[PDB]
């Protein structure tokens, strides 16, 4: 697998739209047909690791991030690996990372976003 995580440009502090895009996740593979993806943080807010909280570097304030509603609906399956839920998607595909839930008022800051991606056959 080859993965890219690309930030969305033009993001502004203040009230953002519901499900405002913030990053794109690209996953490609010449061998594997599918991939699982989970968010990585100290505060994962749902059972599949597809919604989680990220803290700002300079302010320490939290935003809610996760896979978009539309991205979630493209899932092939949910698997269980060592007990942990992993939603799977077709390789050679892009997914949207968004601000989750209702409109968020976002403080101006840098916010690190980390994901685990795994190949599946």
């Amino acid at each position: 697998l080859t993965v890219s995580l690309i930030p969305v440009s033009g993001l502004k502090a203040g009230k953002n739209a519901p499900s405002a895009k913030i990053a794109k996740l690209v996953v490609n593979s010449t061998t594997l047909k599918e991939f699982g993806v989970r968010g990585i943080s100290n505060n994962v807010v749902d059972s599949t690791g597809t919604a989680w909280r990220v803290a700002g570097k300079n302010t320490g304030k939290e935003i809610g991030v996760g896979l978009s509603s539309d991205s979630l609906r493209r899932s092939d399956s949910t698997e269980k690996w060592n007990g942990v839920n992993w939603m799977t998607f077709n390789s050679n595909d892009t997914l949207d990372i968004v601000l989750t839930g209702p409109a968020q008022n976002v403080t101006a800051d840098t916010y690190p976003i980390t994901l685990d991606v795994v190949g599946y056959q």
Partner: peptide, 16 residues
């Protein structure tokens, strides 16, 4: 396929 696993990270910037 655990040997194809990877952690990927980026900074997202909200400007004033």
């Amino acid at each position: 396929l655990p040997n194809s696993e990877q952690q990927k990270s980026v900074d997202i910037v909200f400007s004033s």
